[PDB]
Design a protein around this ligand. Sequence first.
Ligand SMILES: *CCC(=O)N1CCN(c2nnc(-c3ccccc3)c3cc(-c4c(O)cccc4F)c(Cl)cc23)CC1
Ligand SMILES: Nc1nc2c(ncn2[C@@H]2O[C@H](COP(=O)(O)OP(=O)(O)O)[C@@H](O)[C@H]2O)c(=O)[nH]1
Ligand SMILES: [Mg+2]
Length: 160
Amino acid sequence: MTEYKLVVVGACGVGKSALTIQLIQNHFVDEYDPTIEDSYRKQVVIDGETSLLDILDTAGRDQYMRTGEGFLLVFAINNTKSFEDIHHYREQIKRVKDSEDVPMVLVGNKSDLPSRTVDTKQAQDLARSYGIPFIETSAKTRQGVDDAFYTLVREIRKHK
Ligand SMILES: *CCC(=O)N1CCN(c2nnc(-c3ccccc3)c3cc(-c4c(O)cccc4F)c(Cl)cc23)CC1
Ligand SMILES: Nc1nc2c(ncn2[C@@H]2O[C@H](COP(=O)(O)OP(=O)(O)O)[C@@H](O)[C@H]2O)c(=O)[nH]1
Ligand SMILES: [Mg+2]
């Protein structure tokens, strides 16, 4: 039985809240208040081991981020600016965590949408350059949502 502090980061409107609420409440919330930043808790079993997840859904400071054990780097597959922002979020995290190996997962959300502007290959190549996994999600359909969070827990376990 182990605890994990997870932090969900990424540009405004990529689906941080939608992803987190899907994980916790098992339904899709359209346009969750973009200014609400809160922590959520969920107990799960991953690879046989019971895990309590403490999840911070960041919104509109260093202290909270330093206590994070792993980070979901979320962009939206129809929003190139959010994908370009990922390297900046990565840099901010490394600086506050002291540029050490920090468990992270790259998450490409909104996979249900047709107007794609970032391809999986691009995201895989970015994830490869950081030595982290890439997971594609849709908070709307729930595809990949558990995978993103569970993969992060696995990355934290490998680090610990
Ligand atoms: C629409 C409201 C929303 O969802 N917000 C979350 C994203 N917020 C935000 N914007 N910019 C930066 C940033 C990124 C790179 C360089 C400067 C500023 C944000 C950074 C962080 C952050 C910090 O400050 C430290 C460690 C890890 C981080 F992700 C956060 Cl938490 C949020 C940032 C705008 C509001
Ligand atoms: N089509 C689609 N829309 C999404 C998805 N995830 C979030 N959204 C929508 O994208 C917008 C931003 O989502 P939100 O969770 O508020 O993003 P946040 O600012 O990162 O917390 C909202 O209008 C959501 O309903 C998704 O997977 N697919
Ligand atoms: Mg939000």
